[PDB]
Amino acid sequence: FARALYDFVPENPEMEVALKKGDLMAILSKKDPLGRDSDWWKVRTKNGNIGYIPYNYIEII
């Protein structure tokens, strides 16, 4: 899946995941709708945190 680059934080206090520099996360979505180019994906951390996360903040296995 993916890894955590920098300490991430809920972009919005409604739906997002949290990351602590070095953490890890599983990415599913891409651009999300169409699937073009940009850094913004959806993730699942330890199956406990489900939300989004800029691609420039996570590592691709």
Side-chain angles (χ1 to χ4, degrees), residues 8-18 40-43 45 49-54:
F8 184 71
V9 219
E11 155 162 82
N12 244 100
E14 159 99 312
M15 191 149 208
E16 214 84 315
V17 292
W40 252 122
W41 298 336
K42 102 85 149 273
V43 99
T45 104
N49 292 341
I50 298 160
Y52 291 175
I53 165 109

Side-chain angles (χ1 to χ4, degrees), residues 5-6 9 12 21-22 29 32 36-37 42 47 53 59 61:
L5 251 310
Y6 308 86
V9 219
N12 244 100
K21 211 142 180 257
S29 163
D32 204 0
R36 223 168 19 88
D37 247 278
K42 102 85 149 273
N47 332 111
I53 165 109
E59 218 320 270
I61 297 353

Side-chain angles (χ1 to χ4, degrees), residues 22-38:
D23 197 16
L24 253 133
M25 282 191 333
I27 37 152
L28 297 317
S29 163
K30 267 65 82 76
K31 238 312 249 211
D32 204 0
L34 280 82
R36 223 168 19 88
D37 247 278
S38 263

